[PDB]
Amino acid sequence: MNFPNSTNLPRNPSMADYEARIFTFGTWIYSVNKEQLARAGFYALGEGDKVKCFHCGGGLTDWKPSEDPWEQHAKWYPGCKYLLEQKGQEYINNIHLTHSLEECL
Numbered sequence: 001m002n003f004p005n006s007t008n009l010p011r012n013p014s015m016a017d018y019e020a021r022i023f024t025f026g027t028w029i030y031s032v033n034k035e036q037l038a039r040a041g042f043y044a045l046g047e048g049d050k051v052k053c054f055h056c057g058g059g060l061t062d063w064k065p066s067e068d069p070w071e072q073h074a075k076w077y078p079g080c081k082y083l084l085e086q087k088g089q090e091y092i093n094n095i096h097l098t099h100s101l102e103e104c105l
Ligand SMILES: C[C@@H]1CN(CC(=O)N2CC(C)(C)c3ncc(Cc4ccc(F)cc4)cc32)[C@@H](CN2CCOC[C@H]2C)C[NH2+]1
Pocket: 045, 050, 051, 052, 058, 059, 060, 061, 062, 063, 064, 067, 072, 076
């Protein structure tokens, strides 16, 4: 187990570009859209639907069609500086509140 990168510097600069990320997927059979994933800073590992964020290093799996890449990114890797850059702290807050509230019900 590795800690999430919370610095302003990407953990995997090889995957810093959208096109670089998109190449990793190949033919992608999974319920969640590869371009959507690549935009949320994810690249494929080639092991089921395992993705890793290029910046935080944060890893996700088992994508249900209801699950959103940016939402999941914020859920599991709230300290990601890439996430904060693209989405903003107001978005991130909303998502946390929504998830933390989802539990109540
Ligand atoms: C998209 C969504 C993700 N979600 C959480 C998830 O995928 N997380 C949460 C956690 C941070 C605990 C975690 N740690 C390891 C892996 C594995 C991994 C993947 C990529 C990789 F590069 C290296 C390792 C995944 C993972 C799914 C539900 N998860 C499925 C897994 O078991 C925990 C459960 C709650 C539902 N779908």
